[PDB]
Protein backbone atom coordinates (compact mmCIF):
# COMPACT_ATOMS: atom_id res chain seq x y z
CA UNK A 1 0.00 0.00 0.00
CA UNK A 2 1.13 3.59 -0.54
CA UNK A 3 -0.19 7.03 0.37
CA UNK A 4 -1.03 9.46 -2.40
CA UNK A 5 -1.59 13.24 -2.03
CA UNK A 6 -5.09 14.67 -2.26
CA UNK A 7 -6.77 18.01 -1.47
CA UNK A 8 -9.85 18.53 0.66
CA UNK A 9 -12.85 19.91 -1.16
CA UNK A 10 -15.60 19.23 1.43
CA UNK A 11 -16.24 17.08 4.50
CA UNK A 12 -19.67 15.54 3.99
CA UNK A 13 -20.21 13.50 7.16
CA UNK A 14 -18.25 11.28 9.54
CA UNK A 15 -17.10 8.72 6.92
CA UNK A 16 -17.57 10.48 3.53
CA UNK A 17 -15.50 13.36 2.19
CA UNK A 18 -15.04 15.01 -1.20
CA UNK A 19 -11.41 15.31 -2.33
CA UNK A 20 -9.35 16.51 -5.31
CA UNK A 21 -7.58 13.30 -6.34
CA UNK A 22 -5.23 13.32 -9.34
CA UNK A 23 -6.78 16.64 -10.45
CA UNK A 24 -10.41 15.42 -10.49
CA UNK A 25 -13.04 15.89 -7.75
CA UNK A 26 -14.13 12.60 -6.21
CA UNK A 27 -16.20 11.40 -3.24
CA UNK A 28 -14.28 9.11 -0.88
CA UNK A 29 -15.81 6.73 1.61
CA UNK A 30 -13.64 5.58 4.57
CA UNK A 31 -12.59 1.95 4.42
CA UNK A 32 -13.48 -0.55 7.13
CA UNK A 33 -15.50 1.83 9.28
CA UNK A 34 -19.01 3.25 9.63
CA UNK A 35 -19.95 6.52 11.29
CA UNK A 36 -23.64 7.03 12.25
CA UNK A 37 -26.13 8.41 9.72
CA UNK A 38 -27.00 12.11 9.38
CA UNK A 39 -28.51 12.26 5.84
CA UNK A 40 -30.63 9.23 4.94
CA UNK A 41 -34.29 9.57 6.15
CA UNK A 42 -34.64 5.79 6.55
CA UNK A 43 -32.19 5.59 9.49
CA UNK A 44 -32.79 9.19 10.69
CA UNK A 45 -30.13 11.23 12.53
CA UNK A 46 -28.42 8.47 14.46
CA UNK A 47 -26.79 9.09 17.86
CA UNK A 48 -23.20 10.43 17.48
CA UNK A 49 -23.90 11.16 13.79
CA UNK A 50 -23.40 14.93 14.20
CA UNK A 51 -20.39 14.35 16.51
CA UNK A 52 -18.72 11.97 14.03
CA UNK A 53 -19.31 14.58 11.32
CA UNK A 54 -17.76 17.40 13.30
CA UNK A 55 -14.72 15.27 14.30
CA UNK A 56 -13.95 14.32 10.67
CA UNK A 57 -14.56 17.89 9.47
CA UNK A 58 -12.15 19.38 11.99
CA UNK A 59 -9.54 16.68 11.34
CA UNK A 60 -9.50 17.11 7.55
CA UNK A 61 -10.08 20.89 7.43
CA UNK A 62 -7.30 21.56 9.93
CA UNK A 63 -4.73 19.34 8.19
CA UNK A 64 -1.77 20.75 6.27
CA UNK A 65 -1.61 17.62 4.09
CA UNK A 66 -4.27 15.06 3.14
CA UNK A 67 -3.33 11.66 1.75
CA UNK A 68 -5.39 8.79 0.46
CA UNK A 69 -4.24 5.17 0.70
CA UNK A 70 -6.17 2.57 -1.38
CA UNK A 71 -6.12 -1.01 -0.05
CA UNK A 72 -5.30 -4.19 -2.08
CA UNK A 73 -8.93 -4.83 -3.12
CA UNK A 74 -11.73 -2.96 -4.89
CA UNK A 75 -11.08 0.78 -5.06
CA UNK A 76 -14.62 2.10 -5.60
CA UNK A 77 -18.05 1.14 -4.20
CA UNK A 78 -21.17 0.80 -6.34
CA UNK A 79 -21.92 4.50 -5.79
CA UNK A 80 -18.63 5.62 -7.42
CA UNK A 81 -17.11 6.51 -4.03
CA UNK A 82 -13.31 5.95 -3.77
CA UNK A 83 -12.57 3.49 -0.93
CA UNK A 84 -9.45 4.40 1.07
CA UNK A 85 -7.72 5.11 4.36
CA UNK A 86 -7.53 8.89 4.69
CA UNK A 87 -4.63 10.54 6.56
CA UNK A 88 -4.57 14.09 7.89
CA UNK A 89 -0.95 15.03 8.60
CA UNK A 90 -0.07 11.34 8.77
CA UNK A 91 -2.84 10.46 11.22
CA UNK A 92 -5.46 7.99 9.92
CA UNK A 93 -8.98 9.44 10.04
CA UNK A 94 -10.49 5.92 9.94
CA UNK A 95 -8.45 4.87 13.04
CA UNK A 96 -9.03 8.20 14.86
CA UNK A 97 -12.81 7.82 14.55
CA UNK A 98 -12.84 4.24 15.82
CA UNK A 99 -10.52 5.05 18.73
CA UNK A 100 -12.74 8.03 19.68
CA UNK A 101 -15.79 5.66 19.74
CA UNK A 102 -17.34 7.67 16.86
CA UNK A 103 -17.28 4.85 14.22
CA UNK A 104 -17.53 1.07 14.44
CA UNK A 105 -15.43 -1.38 12.35
CA UNK A 106 -17.70 -2.35 9.42
CA UNK A 107 -17.91 -3.51 5.79
CA UNK A 108 -14.64 -5.41 5.95
CA UNK A 109 -14.59 -7.24 2.60
CA UNK A 110 -13.67 -7.47 -1.11
CA UNK A 111 -9.96 -7.66 -0.30
CA UNK A 112 -9.80 -4.40 1.71
CA UNK A 113 -8.70 -5.61 5.15
CA UNK A 114 -5.04 -4.51 5.58
CA UNK A 115 -5.87 -2.36 8.63
CA UNK A 116 -8.47 -4.68 10.16
CA UNK A 117 -6.61 -5.68 13.33
CA UNK A 118 -5.34 -2.08 13.87
CA UNK A 119 -8.93 -0.83 13.71
CA UNK A 120 -10.43 -3.70 15.72
CA UNK A 121 -7.93 -2.99 18.49
CA UNK A 122 -8.86 0.74 18.48
CA UNK A 123 -12.54 -0.32 18.75
CA UNK A 124 -11.94 -2.75 21.65
CA UNK A 125 -10.16 0.12 23.48
CA UNK A 126 -12.96 2.65 22.83
CA UNK A 127 -15.43 -0.05 24.01
CA UNK A 128 -13.41 -0.66 27.21
CA UNK A 129 -13.45 3.12 27.82
CA UNK A 130 -17.23 3.28 27.15
CA UNK A 131 -16.47 6.20 24.90
CA UNK A 132 -19.31 7.84 22.93
CA UNK A 133 -21.09 5.14 20.85
CA UNK A 134 -20.09 2.59 23.52
CA UNK A 135 -21.34 4.75 26.43
Ligand SMILES: Cc1cn([C@H]2C[C@H](OP(=O)(O)O)[C@@H](COP(=O)(O)O)O2)c(=O)[nH]c1=O
Nearest residue numbers: 016029030031032033034035077078083107
Ligand atom coordinates in the same frame (compact mmCIF):
# COMPACT_ATOMS: atom_id res chain seq x y z
C1 LIG B 1 -17.11 1.18 3.47
C2 LIG B 1 -17.79 0.51 2.30
C3 LIG B 1 -19.13 0.75 2.04
N1 LIG B 1 -19.71 0.12 0.98
C4 LIG B 1 -21.13 0.33 0.68
C5 LIG B 1 -21.96 -0.75 1.39
C6 LIG B 1 -23.24 -0.01 1.67
O1 LIG B 1 -24.08 -0.15 0.50
P1 LIG B 1 -25.68 -0.08 0.63
O2 LIG B 1 -25.99 1.26 1.24
O3 LIG B 1 -26.06 -0.23 -0.83
O4 LIG B 1 -25.96 -1.31 1.44
C7 LIG B 1 -22.82 1.44 1.86
C8 LIG B 1 -22.57 1.80 3.33
O5 LIG B 1 -22.00 3.11 3.33
P2 LIG B 1 -22.63 4.37 4.10
O6 LIG B 1 -22.32 4.08 5.57
O7 LIG B 1 -21.90 5.58 3.54
O8 LIG B 1 -24.09 4.37 3.76
O9 LIG B 1 -21.57 1.58 1.17
C9 LIG B 1 -18.99 -0.76 0.15
O10 LIG B 1 -19.56 -1.30 -0.83
N2 LIG B 1 -17.68 -1.00 0.36
C10 LIG B 1 -17.05 -0.43 1.41
O11 LIG B 1 -15.84 -0.68 1.59
Ligand SMILES: [Ca+2]
Nearest residue numbers: 015034035036
Ligand atom coordinates in the same frame (compact mmCIF):
# COMPACT_ATOMS: atom_id res chain seq x y z
CA1 LIG C 1 -22.08 5.83 7.52
